[PDB]
Design a protein around this nucleic acid. Structure first.
Ligand SMILES: [Mg+2]
Ligand SMILES: [Mg+2]
Ligand SMILES: [Mg+2]
Ligand SMILES: [Mg+2]
Ligand SMILES: [Mg+2]
Ligand SMILES: [Mg+2]
Ligand SMILES: [Mg+2]
Ligand SMILES: [Mg+2]
Ligand SMILES: [Mg+2]
Ligand SMILES: [Mg+2]
Ligand SMILES: [Mg+2]
Ligand SMILES: [Mg+2]
Ligand SMILES: [Mg+2]
Ligand SMILES: [Mg+2]
Ligand SMILES: [Mg+2]
Ligand SMILES: [Mg+2]
Ligand SMILES: [Mg+2]
Ligand SMILES: [Mg+2]
Ligand SMILES: [Mg+2]
Ligand SMILES: [Mg+2]
Ligand SMILES: [Mg+2]
Ligand SMILES: [Mg+2]
Lengths: 218, 129, 88
RNA sequence: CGUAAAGCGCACGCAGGCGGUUUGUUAAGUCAGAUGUGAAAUCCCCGGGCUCAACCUGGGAACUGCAUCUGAUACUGGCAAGCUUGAGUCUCGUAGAGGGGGGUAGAAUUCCAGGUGUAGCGGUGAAAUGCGUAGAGAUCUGGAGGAAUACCGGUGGCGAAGGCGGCCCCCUGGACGAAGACUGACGCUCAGGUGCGAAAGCGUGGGGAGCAAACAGGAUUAGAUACCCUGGUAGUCCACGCCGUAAACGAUGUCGACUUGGAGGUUGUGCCCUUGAGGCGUGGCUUCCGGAGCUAACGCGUUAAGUCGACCGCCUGGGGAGUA
RNA sequence: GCAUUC
């Protein structure tokens, strides 16, 4: 609901003219979002996500900024959905069949680590190849078990993750994004105006969406 | 100097449609109201209004369908530098009848279809798509 | 350009009253007064081209106003030129 | 028509083209109908006849035009009365290398006279020509003369363009702001025409410190009619007149309307005002980066090369040739 | 410092 936080936008000189409808005022040289307008749109997106969750769809969370890398993982653990909390590799979806091999490598690398066959006297086997695990785990760990393209995209910043937005539009996947004053609209089907970096705001967003999916999933 | 109030009028709709403006305002005139009156008839503009007596101002409420401008294209045909007069049988059709050309007949400003039905010619003002 | 005292005198002489500064005769009279005054200026400043450009602007403006006055009503135009002693 | 061929160097302007808004009136343009005419053939459409076809032939349409008559009055034009937003005048202020004339100051270069003083100075990649024991260069004092105005000085300002920098006075043009009053379309553009127009150049008469085509010498080089060096005339300066050309460039004609933004500079102005080398608005000019859109691309992008309108200029493969 | 040509 219309609680504290979120309303704090970016500085006026970094604003994007396209979101003139969604701004309320330039308080203290900082734009503040029209919350009363945000709530109907936020609820709409939440309702749409529930409908997508109702049909056993898959929604993937995209947060790259350090302020949200840890939070998105918690959302992916509260529910059973997927996420990307580090750098979003170009072509995650356009050529998913190419990175699919990279996912397979994790399954083999994970198998050796868990089964103990990598515990050999050579440090090339023990360290040189094992270090690739977190390299691909921190990079593809949250996308391991998608098994294909998602059914909806949740983005914490429509501009910082502009690469993710562009790929979703090309594939036609529905896009839900937290769009801050400086971000670019018209690339997101359902735009959620508000702050993207405030910890109390990001936690509320991913925490809120993580609840509708579970009830919608039933 | 401003020599084409009609052309400036049409330009504002074209510019307003491109900019996704809800409405555009400009100085009012009986001829402009005549053009504005016909345009509202077919649904190209949601409505028009005139405000002021000594300084009348014409405001047109533009409309959009599926997020794109309803007026696909609008161009001035008759100009002060070169004016166009068509007979009853020479009335043009825009987009093979999907569009309409505003014709200033002796009975008043009306669409080409109306002028053809009434059987009068006159000035071809503009084409609306 | 022209002193305020001289400007007021012309306005009160050619116009209907002292606050009617828009009358065509007033405008022509003001321009004619300055043009006549500048005659001495360019008599000795023969090479002063930049200010001479402004003078021709007043000359052209006066001719444009006179033509309008003639078109609207010849009667007043004939009287105005006689009093100003121009159009020779 | 920014860079491929193409925006006059820039202005003022007659003829011409075009023109804000309201009412009445005219019915010229325009539109409708009718009449006369638009020869026949040909083309055209439906038929007929040569065995079919070509060909011939009946009727129709067509001949997009012109003239007259009868009507319509939206639009353009004519006429009459209006209106204030275009444009212009007035009042009060502000900034500025805007222009013309006169005066004056300081630093510096060169030259002239004199003192001190002794063997070098000057110059180059190196060197020499050159200057100097007839006392140079250096250093100090006085004097003469010409030119340009360090710092300020800034993609700062002004002007139509060219262009315009010390200070002061005289004459003078334009621009902008604040409200208020006044005229009431008096406007925009412009062939021909006319005016202005860097530098170089030409004519007459002055002036001439520095700089410097030409020219001379010394070098460099295979040569060096150059680059470098030492000298140096016209010119550069002033008055008047002529020349009218520049990559005279934003390689982008002028005027008006419309169309997301961001950061500065410059020059007015309103307002909150005690919590000032403050806070929020509103004009003019100007620099940079960028959105839609546009463009062959580069890029332009509210100061358009975007979306429109009025008028003018100009282009039509390269060379020959902006030449005969 | 100078230093051409195919
Ligand atoms: Mg070229
Ligand atoms: Mg060219
Ligand atoms: Mg030019
Ligand atoms: Mg008119
Ligand atoms: Mg008639
Ligand atoms: Mg015939
Ligand atoms: Mg037959
Ligand atoms: Mg026949
Ligand atoms: Mg009329
Ligand atoms: Mg000419
Ligand atoms: Mg010269
Ligand atoms: Mg000379
Ligand atoms: Mg001489
Ligand atoms: Mg020399
Ligand atoms: Mg030329
Ligand atoms: Mg120049
Ligand atoms: Mg330049
Ligand atoms: Mg040119
Ligand atoms: Mg002009
Ligand atoms: Mg740009
Ligand atoms: Mg020649
Ligand atoms: Mg040879």
């Amino acid at each position: 609901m219309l609680k504290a936080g979120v309303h704090f936008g970016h500085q006026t000189r970094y604003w994007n003219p396209k979101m003139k409808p969604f701004i309320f005022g330039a308080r203290n040289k900082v734009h503040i979002i029209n919350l009363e307008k945000t709530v109907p749109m936020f609820n709409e997106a939440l309702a749409e996500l529930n409908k997508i969750a109702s049909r056993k769809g898959k929604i993937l969370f995209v947060g790259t900024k350090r302020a949200a890398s840890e939070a998105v993982k918690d959302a992916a653990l509260s529910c059973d959905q997927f996420f990307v909390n580090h750098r979003w590799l170009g072509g995650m979806l356009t050529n998913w069949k190419t990175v699919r091999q990279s996912i397979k490598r994790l399954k083999d690398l994970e198998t050796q680590s868990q089964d103990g066959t990598f515990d050999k006297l050579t440090k090339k086997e023990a360290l040189m190849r094992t270090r690739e695990l977190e390299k691909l785990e921190n990079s593809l760990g949250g996308i391991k078990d998608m098994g294909g393209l998602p059914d909806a995209l949740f983005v914490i910043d429509a501009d910082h993750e502009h690469i993710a937005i562009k790929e979703a539009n090309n594939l036609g996947i529905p896009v839900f994004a937290i769009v801050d004053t400086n971000s670019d609209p018209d690339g997101v089907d359902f735009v959620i105006p508000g702050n993207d970096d405030a910890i109390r705001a990001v936690t509320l967003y991913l925490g809120a969406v993580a609840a509708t999916v579970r009830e919608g999933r039933s | 100097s401003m020599q084409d109030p009609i052309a400036d009028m049409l330009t504002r709709i074209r510019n307003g449609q491109a900019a996704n403006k809800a409405a555009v305002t400009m100085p009012s005139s009986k001829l402009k109201v005549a053009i504005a009156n016909v345009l509202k008839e077919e649904g190209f503009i949601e409505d028009f209004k005139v405000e002021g007596d000594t300084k009348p101002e014409l405001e047109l409420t533009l409309k959009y369908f599926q997020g794109k401008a309803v007026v696909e294209s609008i161009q001035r045909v008759s100009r002060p530098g070169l004016r166009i007069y068509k007979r009853k049988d020479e009335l043009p059709k825009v987009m093979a009848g999907l569009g309409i050309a505003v014709v200033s007949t002796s009975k008043g400003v009306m669409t080409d279809r109306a002028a053809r039905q009434a059987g009068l010619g006159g000035e071809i003002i503009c084409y609306v798509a | 350009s022209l002193s305020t005292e001289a400007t007021a005198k012309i306005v009160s002489e050619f116009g209907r009253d002292a606050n009617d500064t828009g009358s065509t005769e007033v405008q022509v009279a003001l321009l004619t007064a300055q043009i006549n005054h500048l005659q001495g200026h360019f008599a000795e400043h023969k090479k002063d081209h930049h200010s001479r450009r402004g003078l021709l602007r007043m000359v052209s403006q006066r001719r444009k106003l006179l033509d309008y006055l003639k078109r609207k009503d010849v009667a007043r135009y004939t009287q105005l030129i006689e009093r100003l002693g121009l159009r020779r």
